[PDB]
């Protein structure tokens, strides 16, 4: 019996329970965005603004249901409307992580017919983050 | 003289069988699978169903002359023989939009299925489909949030949601409930839930549970850094109790409650849906009791109609069946009503049991929930059938893991994410499904432990509700 | 015993043939049709498990509680005579499983999921034994038969009513006109059709007002108390309550609710409102036959009738036996006793699987309605006796001379039969003679006798014992 | 390379003039009598009206790409010249039913007549007619009673109803108001009325009026045997 | 005053040009919930015009995308964003989802910039009860400001809303949707100055005033006239500005004019010159149409406003040197330069209909 650790084991939604994505794996996910005609976009956040929190609720009456701070991250430039080139997306990931090397950065994509984000996963976490475990240190 | 009052009995077909009628775009349409008694013509049987679900009774009444029967009568406008059946017919009935109370599923059901199923003159009757016109759809508040909004509130994209029902069904204390909830959530499940029959009982009172569950939710959310929720059951014996439970959830600031809409009822459910809209709670709908109504091919109401009824009454999730699990649900039948639950516009398609083109006129979609007798080896098939816009629930498949709830949850989460990644990379889950799972059991000890326990477990039986 | 992960048979935990049922247990009789290759014992044990504590694989959390204390138990399996693959499975549920006062909860456990199991082909709930200890947790009927008769000052005969027709399409003013003419001719009650709620052609509050005018006019004209079942059935609990409240403020005696289409949660709420405000509550069973018609699958009406008595209602539709809607005689006499009596002994020739003790909970007035007319009166009086309401929609508004003569015809018929029975005449043998003597005396009755003389509803019964 | 974001101003007609559009039965339709400024083509002017009453503004915005403009945009689908006029056109606009708040006339007016009448690029604009589709009509409670029910509650049939506004418009006391009301109602009128500007004023407070009028209504009703109102 | 007379057969046309509201009648009104001084004090914003932006497209955006666009606008230098006048509650976006996502966006921007932020949440609704429900949710979210469409919602509802705002501490932004149906033609209707006086009595903290230079009509002298009527305590008769009567407001709070519609960075000098500091300048397309997105768009408008304000404070004449101030600023700021380039040639110059 192995024990899932509650200490410094924070996750990051889709794909965070899998081995970290290789560059070939990231490229495959980008190919999937372009093949489906979805709109790629990059978002980023400093470490203090990366995880869901509650601080604003101090101002509230009884209306905190489904309100969380830090859901919104900051948009890198604009969504890539009309982009059908996967290499162009990869080049923006590089440019974004270069501009903000200490930020969390995620790749998302939008479907404009459903008007919803249709996919999303982390592509960079800061090197100083100590609040996560590698796959093989997740249980003890 | 013209047409006067003549007392006495005449055939229903003289007034209510109208094969030349061109349906209006505001008419509600019903498709009934009808089995007449011997010596009852199909035309008379269809006319009787039309009549007694709209304006007519068994003998002529004088009061018809004060109104316009042409304007208000239901009309059996088409009768289709059923292939493979000696004595079964699809009778099509059109109802003027004027017959129905705006925003009331209760009233729609009372007319269309109220008395006709008990007529001596038929042996069996089944409502297969309903065409709800946009003009009537627009009179409903509908789902409190719907799929897009739910995903936006939860900040969850790119995969199915994962859940689990706490077990045993009954008999756990409020403190043990919260303990199990916390261990499930912390392992990677997005939601847990009260069992459909967990309301308030001598072994655990509701408000004790809500409090311990809130503690569990917030602990897992702080631990994992992901938004978590637990479908707290607001189902109750009275509207006043139900509302009390919803109010407590609002005051705890938790994201989501549940309702058993058939055993609680449409009048209570609509009220709860409106409360959830006004207070920003997600509403998970359990379909307890549906199979009493929708199992048999010859008699009852097909689930696709009960699913349409729910979308009107209000619900962010509805249970949809698993296809591969312990409870019945044929693949093609299921894919049909999932589209009816989720999509804005569904074209007639009889190979999936869709008798009418249905236009939802932008009423939000309902998240289908796959639940019951499913485990890790079912994952590829589930993701293939449902896609990302679904919640997949594992009660036994989580609490039955040899290492406990958190490893159980992580096994399920690893399975889901591996399948989603494989599909995204262009792999066919219908065929490479076992390979994806095997490669994943080899990588993850938690997943391997689950794979070993449930390897031989399948649910393969003759289907009752066949097309 | 430790935690062992994995699937095992349900029968290892949930089939307990040596179990002695407790007097506080809820009992259920399921008519069960297993898939080929599934033993009856395993199928019954699966029904007991999935409607109480169990799921499809072993869970560790059972060890934290006491499964013996809480589990449902299949304690007896009976073969069905005349059937190759049908069984009656008897399940016992600890009283601890159930929310006090909630019919909704009881249904959710007992009929929640088990009917959709792949491992069975069909399932029907035939009967429930509701123990006194659970019955007492329910408010129950707002008034019940004795109180209703006392408030209405009506004794010594069946009550007479009528559903206004056409079902839909009449204006509020025409609705009240029809009501006034029915009531003034001898009927005690008229009613909104089940599907008359609030519609483009007639809004509810307009109806309530015109109907109140009609009730009061007919009451002043006849000198007898009158009422009209005003439909409170609505889309939401808030609308339903708004309609109940308006009836309260008009001072009228009675409202109605469609308890299956509205639901148990709304119905219980309404029944408590009626109790606290002194309104009688007529219950319409719209939708029941979707659930209760077929012998092989669903829930028998007697269980839906028990549920209503617990949930609350002063009247419940019972079927006619002889009218346009199905209802076998022996089956109907069975659940009528379950609706009205304090104590009903087990009697399989009437579909009663369990002795039922209602522990002083008030009885519900049966309402016979649907395709009935003057010639049915001897049969109705013989089947139901005085404690019933007999409703004639078409049988009143279909009279050649209009509503008042139609009402008078039905009232004459009912009183003639009542008098004849009181004098020692056997209505089963002399019923035709009673009606004929009455059609000869009363021109209103004669006109109705002539129109419907040849009209019968005789078909093969689907819901057979 | 697909359709991307291009910043800047372009003609409204490129997006909002759709002369081959087949109107849906759920669309709200508007008929505008339009007088363009000199040098503005009727097509551009009709397109501007359609745009700025639905989804558009004066320059291209990037957020269009996140949604479906095809689904939501107003559409000028027909432009009719006015006979007898040099510079007047009937422009016909279709609005998807999704644009409107259910049950709100306020919201319908805010979109359709909100800003467009003040545009520099037109000299005059008149809204002539609206087609309200059944699907939108059904979202409104509508009239409390309506003609049939009114006649049924008042028990008045076979003739027009007769009324009268009390005069002088302002300046009468509550007591004199009810006195005038009683004398009108008793003579054969079904109704009397408050003048539109009679609300609650220093010469007569409302509740004093309501009481004296109620007295008057009931006295005339008893006197004549006919239902009266004010 | 306007009830029946405009329909009389004996006249061909009638227009109400002005009303003299006496102090004795003015004093019977609750009036604006806060007014200019109080608004600036609560917002802690002094020494420049306020900057805002309407979210676009007008309709069609989801609640999540709405808040996303709001957060990007506010974080770049705008004080306010706003619901478009016709954004209420619709199938594409229900009001309470929008309110919640907008609150998140407001608080994120405020934390990120260190300046107070707001977004005029639209309370306009079909019924008074629905309008109140929306006001109550804004109150419970602790956000600063709501809006109402006073002519399409109506005076009775508006006055009720204003009183609610006074009693609960919300600022009230008034949109004048439908005014031009009534006030455009010289021969017939009611002049906007009367509609603006009515609003100051009914209650509002902001009222749309027109731009003079933008896509919608508003003659300079006319506009300066009613802007004084909105803001000042005492305005003397002045027919060259369309003021027919001396108006004494007897200490009733002043209403902040809002200049909005077809305006961009090049208009900034003219806007600052016409309105001065006690105004809000709104840029919908002028923010969301910037080639680099909302935040750079917001920064461009903020730089332009601050450059003009600084120049005026230094004694420069914005009427004569306005272009020089903007050019010096586009040279310094890349965000501004990108805006300057896109809208350089864009002007709205047409024959005026509502002439004095
Ligand atoms: O009570 C149960 O059995 C479940 O909690 C599943 O438990 P397990 O996950 O442990 O099987 C669900 O309520 C059923 O799936 C409902 O059926 P459906 O979705 O068909 O309505
Ligand atoms: O709608 C009808 O058909 C009735 O009004 C009867 O009308 P008539 O009197 O004109 O036949 C009753 O609702 C049915 O009897 C209900 O059946 P049940 O009592 O079996 O539930
Ligand atoms: O809907 C619009 O057009 C605006 O949002 C401006 O958008 P842009 O900034 O994109 O032009 C404003 O509501 C109008 O300015 C109102 O006009 P006014 O202030 O004259 O009443
Ligand atoms: Mg369950
Ligand atoms: Mg009926
Ligand atoms: Mg007048
Ligand atoms: Mg606007």
Grouping H, G, I as helix, E, B as strand and the rest as coil, residue A11 is coil
Q: Which member of C5, C65, C398 has the closest CB to residue B400?
A: C5
How far away, in angstroms, is E261 Cα from ligand 3 center? 4
B280 and B384 fall within a common domain = yes
Token digits of residue D27: 């669309």
- E1, burial (CB in 10 Å: exposed 0-12, middle 13-18, buried 19+): exposed
Closest CA to E29 of E255, E257, E253: E253
Grouping H, G, I as helix, E, B as strand and the rest as coil, residue C163 is strand
Ligand-binding annotation for D115, yes or no, is yes
Measured at the CA of B160, the angle between CA B158 and CA B162, to 5 degrees, comes to 130
C101 and C227 fall within a common domain = no
CB-side exposure of C91: number of CA atoms within 13 Å? 35
Catalytic residue check, B259: no
B264 and B302 fall within a common domain = yes
Query: D66–A39: do the CB atoms touch at under 8 Å?
Result: yes
Contacts with D98 from chain B: Cβ below 8 Å = 362
Our CA-based measurement puts residue D55 at a distance from the nearest CA of chain B, in whole angstroms, of 17
3-state secondary structure E239-271: HHHCECCCEECCCCCCCEEEEECCCCHHHHHHH
Q: Which member of E75, E107, E292 has the closest CB to residue A56?
A: E107
Closest CA to A14 of E223, B226, B383: B226
Closest CA to A51 of B186, E97, B223: B223
For chains B and D, what is the number of CB pairs under 8 angstroms?
Answer: 25
For the sheet with C365-369, list strands across it: C159-161, C389-391, C365-369, C315-317, C280-284, C254-258, C227-231, C189-191
DSSP secondary structure letters along C64-89: GS-HHHH--EEEEEEEPTT-SS-EEE
B193/B231 Cα distance (integer angstroms): 4
C39/E28 Cα distance (integer angstroms): 86
- Domain ranges in chain A are 2-140
Closest CA to E53 of E36, E72, E40: E72
- The CA R_g of chain E, rounded to the nearest whole Å, is 20
Contacts with B410 from chain A: Cβ below 8 Å = 4, 17, 138-139
Has residue C458 been placed in a domain?
no
C191/C212 Cα distance (integer angstroms): 12
Query: What is the enclosing helix (H) or strand (E) of B319?
Result: strand B317-319
Ranges of beta strands (E only) in D105-230 are 122-131
Closest CA to E105 of E132, E83, E134, E88: E83
Residue B118 alpha carbon, nearest atom of ligand 2: 20
CATH architecture classification, A2-140:
2-Layer Sandwich (3.30)
Our CA-based measurement puts residue E84 at a distance from the nearest CA of chain B, in whole angstroms, of 21
| Crossing angle between the packed helical segments C264-277 and C237-250, to the nearest 10 degrees | 20
Q: Could you tell me the CA-to-CA distances from B366 to A40, B123, B317, B319 in Å, in that order?
A: 26, 35, 5, 10
Q: Look-up: residue for tokens 């007392």?
A: B7
CATH number of the domain bearing residue D126:
3.30.70.150
Buried b / exposed e over B70-89, threshold 16 CB at 10 Å, is eebbbbbbbbeeeeeeeebb
Query: E217–D119: do the CB atoms touch at under 8 Å?
Result: yes
Closest CA to B461 of C35, C296, C123, C8: C35
Has residue C457 been placed in a domain?
no
C178/A71 Cα distance (integer angstroms): 62
Cα E6 to chain centroid, rounded: 30
Closest CA to E200 of E225, E233, E223, E238: E233
Label residue D225 left, alpha or beta by phi (over 0 means left) and psi (-120 to 50 means alpha): left
Which residues, including other chains, have CB under 8 Å from residue B318's CB and lie 6 or more apart?
A: B285, B287, B307, B310, B311, B341, B366, B367, B368, B369
C67/C69 Cα distance (integer angstroms): 5
Query: What is the enclosing helix (H) or strand (E) of D211?
Result: helix D206-224
| Crossing angle between the packed helical segments B405-424 and B174-186, to the nearest 10 degrees | 30
**Phi then psi for C159, rounded to 5 degrees?**
-85, 150
C197/C213 Cα distance (integer angstroms): 19
**Phi then psi for D93, rounded to 5 degrees?**
-120, 135
**Count of domains observed in chain C:** 2
Closest CA to C253 of C182, C190, C168: C190
B441/E35 Cα distance (integer angstroms): 67
Q: Give me the numbers of helices (H) and strands (E) for chain C, helices first please.
A: 19, 15
Contacts with A16 from chain B: Cβ below 8 Å = 417
Token digits of residue B465: 């509700």
DSSP secondary structure code for residue B34 in this structure: E
DSSP secondary structure letters along B88-157: -EEEEEEE-GGGS-TT-HHHHHHHHHSSGGGBTTEEEEEEEEEE--HHHHTT----SS-HHHHHHHHT--
**Of the bound ligands, which one is closest to the alpha carbon of residue C287?**
2
Contacts with B116 from chain C: Cβ below 8 Å = 289
CB B409 within 8 A of CB B398: yes
Residue of D nearest to E192 (CA): D118
Token digits of residue E249: 């407001």
How far away, in angstroms, is C286 Cα from ligand 5 center? 8
B411 and B441 fall within a common domain = yes
Token digits of residue A128: 């100083």
How far away, in angstroms, is C393 Cα from ligand 5 center? 8
Has residue B7 been placed in a domain?
no
Long-range CB contacts for residues C215-224, cutoff 8 Å, separation at least 24: C215/C179, C215/C183, C215/C252, C217/C180, C217/C184, C218/C179, C218/C180, C218/C183, C218/C184, C219/C183, C221/C184, C222/C183, C222/C184, C222/C186, C224/C154, C224/C188
DSSP secondary structure code for residue B188 in this structure: T
Q: Could you tell me the CA-to-CA distances from E356 to B364, E218, E225, E230, E245 in Å, in that order?
A: 51, 11, 11, 19, 15
B76/B94 Cα distance (integer angstroms): 6
C210 and C94 fall within a common domain = no
Ligand 1 first shell, C-beta below 6 A? B 165, 167, 195-196, 287, 319, 321, 326-327, 371-373, 393-396; C 50, 55-56, 113, 116
Q: Give yes or no for D145 touching C (CB within 8 A).
A: yes
Q: Give nearest CA residue, ligand 2 atom 6.
A: C370
Contact C317 CB / ligand 2 (< 6 Å): yes
Query: What is the enclosing helix (H) or strand (E) of E16?
Result: strand E15-16
- A6, burial (CB in 10 Å: exposed 0-12, middle 13-18, buried 19+): middle
CB-side exposure of C9: number of CA atoms within 13 Å? 11
B76 and B203 fall within a common domain = no
Catalytic residue check, B401: no
Q: Which of E42, E45, E56, E139 is catalytic?
A: E56
C74 and C169 fall within a common domain = no
Token digits of residue D54: 């639905």
Long-range CB contacts for residues B334-341, cutoff 8 Å, separation at least 24: B334/B385, B335/B385, B336/B304, B337/B303, B337/B304, B337/B307, B338/B368, B338/B386, B340/B304, B340/B307, B340/B308, B340/B311, B341/B307, B341/B311, B341/B365, B341/B366, B341/B367, B341/B368
Residues 47-106, chain D, touching B (beta carbon < 8 A): 97-98, 102
Q: Give me the numbers of helices (H) and strands (E) for chain B, helices first please.
A: 19, 15
Q: Give the helix, strand, coil percentages of chain A, each rounded to 5.
A: 30, 20, 50
Q: Give nearest CA residue, ligand 3 atom 1.
A: E84
Q: Count Cβ atoms below 10 Å from residue D88 Cβ, excluding itself.
A: 18
Buried b / exposed e over B142-163, threshold 16 CB at 10 Å, is bbbbbbbbbbbbbbbbbbbbbb
D96/D54 Cα distance (integer angstroms): 9
Has residue C463 been placed in a domain?
no
DSSP secondary structure code for residue D38 in this structure: T
C42 and C170 fall within a common domain = no
CB E218 within 8 A of CB E226: no
Token digits of residue D51: 């745009």
C318 is in which domain, residue-wise? Answer: 139-452
Label residue B253 left, alpha or beta by phi (over 0 means left) and psi (-120 to 50 means alpha): left
Buried b / exposed e over C336-366, threshold 16 CB at 10 Å, is bbbbbeeebeeeeebbbbbebbbeebbbbbb
Q: Look-up: residue for tokens 């407070």?
A: D205
> Helix H segments across chain E?
23-26, 36-43, 63-75, 95-113, 128-141, 150-153, 155-168, 179-183, 192-202, 220-231, 268-275, 285-288, 294-313, 318-332, 334-343
Whether E contacts C, i.e. 3 or more CB pairs less than 8 A apart, is no
C371 and C245 fall within a common domain = yes
CB B233 within 8 A of CB C112: no
Our CA-based measurement puts residue D121 at a distance from the nearest CA of chain E, in whole angstroms, of 7
How far away, in angstroms, is D190 Cα from ligand 6 center? 17
Which residues, including other chains, have CB under 8 Å from residue D39's CB and lie 6 or more apart?
A: none
Which residues, including other chains, have CB under 8 Å from residue C104's CB and lie 6 or more apart?
A: B199, B235, B236, B237, B260, B263, B264, B265, C263, C264, C265, C268
Q: Which of D10, D167, D175, D219 is catalytic?
A: D167
Contact E85 CB / ligand 3 (< 6 Å): yes
Q: Could you tell me the CA-to-CA distances from C238 to B271, C244, C270, E153, E164 in Å, in that order?
A: 7, 10, 11, 27, 27
Our CA-based measurement puts residue C190 at a distance from the nearest CA of chain D, in whole angstroms, of 21
Whether D contacts E, i.e. 3 or more CB pairs less than 8 A apart, is yes
CB C207 within 8 A of CB C215: no
C313/B187 Cα distance (integer angstroms): 48
Closest CA to B270 of B140, B358, B115, B431: B140
User: CA torsion sign, B203 to B206 to B212 to B213?
Assistant: positive
CB B138 within 8 A of CB B361: yes
- C384, burial (CB in 10 Å: exposed 0-12, middle 13-18, buried 19+): buried
D13/D123 Cα distance (integer angstroms): 19
C230/C253 Cα distance (integer angstroms): 10
Biggest CA-to-CA distance, chain B: 90
Contacts with D136 from chain B: Cβ below 8 Å = 138
D123/C439 Cα distance (integer angstroms): 84
What residues form DSSP beta bridges with A77? none
Q: Which residues surround ligand 6, an ion (CB under 5 A)?
A: D 165, 195-196
Our CA-based measurement puts residue E151 at a distance from the nearest CA of chain B, in whole angstroms, of 27
C270/C281 Cα distance (integer angstroms): 8
D180/D161 Cα distance (integer angstroms): 19
Q: Give nearest CA residue, ligand 3 atom 15.
A: E261
Query: What is the enclosing helix (H) or strand (E) of C316?
Result: strand C315-317
Do the bridges between strand E247-248 and strand E234-235 make them parallel or antiparallel, or are there none, so unpaired? antiparallel
How long, in residues, is chain A?
Answer: 140
Q: Could you tell me the CA-to-CA distances from C189 to B334, C48, C154, C204, C228 in Å, in that order?
A: 47, 45, 12, 18, 5
C243 and C384 fall within a common domain = yes
């Amino acid at each position: 019996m192995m024990v899932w650790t509650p200490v410094n084991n924070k996750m990051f939604e889709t794909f965070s329970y899998l081995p970290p994505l290789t560059d070939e794996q990231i490229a495959a996910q980008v190919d999937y965005i372009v093949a489906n005609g979805w709109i790629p976009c990059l978002e980023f956040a400093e470490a203090d603004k990366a995880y869901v929190s509650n601080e604003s609720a101090i101002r509230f009456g009884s209306v905190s249901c489904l309100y969380y701070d830090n859901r919104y991250w900051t948009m890198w430039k604009l969504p890539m409307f009309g982009c059908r080139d996967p290499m162009q997306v990869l080049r923006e990931i590089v440019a974004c992580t270069k501009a903000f090397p200490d930020a969390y950065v995620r790749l998302v994509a939008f479907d404009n017919q459903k008007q919803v984000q249709i996919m999303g996963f982390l592509v960079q976490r800061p090197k100083t983050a100590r609040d996560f475990q590698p796959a093989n240190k997740r249980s003890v | 003289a013209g047409a006067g009052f003549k007392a006495g009995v005449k055939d229903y077909r003289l007034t209510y069988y109208t094969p030349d009628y061109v349906v209006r775009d505001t008419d509600i349409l019903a498709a009934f699978r009808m089995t007449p008694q011997p010596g009852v013509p199909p035309e008379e049987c269809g006319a009787a169903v039309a009549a007694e679900s709209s304006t007519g009774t068994w003998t002529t009444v004088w009061t018809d002359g004060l109104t316009s029967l042409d304007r208000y009568k239901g009309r059996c406008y088409d009768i289709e023989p059923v292939p493979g059946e000696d004595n079964q017919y699809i009778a099509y009935v059109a109802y003027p939009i004027d017959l129905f109370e705006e925003g009331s599923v209760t009233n729609m059901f009372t007319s269309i299925v109220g008395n006709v199923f008990g007529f001596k003159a038929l042996r069996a009757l089944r409502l297969e489909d309903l065409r709800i016109p946009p003009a009537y759809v627009k009179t409903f508040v509908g789902p409190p949030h719907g799929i897009q909004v739910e995903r936006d509130k939860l900040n969850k994209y790119g995969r199915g949601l994962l859940g689990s029902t706490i077990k045993p069904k009954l008999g756990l204390s409020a403190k043990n409930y919260g303990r199990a909830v916390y261990e499930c959530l912390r392992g990677g499940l997005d939601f847990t839930k009260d069992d459909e029959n967990v309301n308030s009982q001598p072994f655990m009172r509701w408000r004790d549970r809500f409090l311990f569950v809130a503690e569990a939710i917030y602990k897992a959310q702080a631990e994992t850094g992901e938004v978590k929720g637990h479908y707290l059951n607001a189902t109750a014996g009275t509207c006043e109790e139900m509302m009390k439970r919803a109010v407590c959830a609002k005051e705890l600031g938790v994201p989501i409650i549940m309702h058993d809409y058939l055993t609680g009822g449409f009048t209570a459910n609509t009220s709860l849906a409106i409360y959830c809209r006004d207070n920003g709670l997600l509403l998970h709908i359990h379909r307890a009791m549906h199979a009493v109504i929708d199992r048999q091919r010859n008699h009852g109401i097909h689930f696709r109609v009960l699913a349409k009824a729910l979308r009107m009454s209000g619900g962010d999730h509805l249970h949809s069946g698993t296809v591969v699990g312990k409870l019945e649900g044929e693949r093609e039948v299921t894919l049909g009503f999932v589209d009816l639950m989720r999509d804005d516009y569904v074209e007639k398609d009889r190979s999936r049991g869709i008798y009418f083109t249905q236009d939802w006129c932008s009423m939000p979609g309902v998240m289908p929930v796959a639940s019951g007798g499913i485990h890790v080896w079912h994952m590829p098939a589930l993701v293939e059938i449902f896609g990302d816009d679904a919640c997949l629930q594992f009660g036994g498949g989580t609490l039955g893991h040899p290492w406990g709830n958190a490893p159980g949850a992580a096994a399920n989460r690893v399975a889901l994410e591996a399948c989603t990644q494989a599909r995204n990379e262009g792999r066919d889950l219908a065929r490479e499904g076992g390979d994806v799972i095997r490669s994943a059991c080899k990588w993850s000890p938690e997943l391997a432990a689950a794979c070993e326990v449930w390897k031989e477990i399948k649910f393969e039986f003759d289907t009752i509700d066949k097309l």
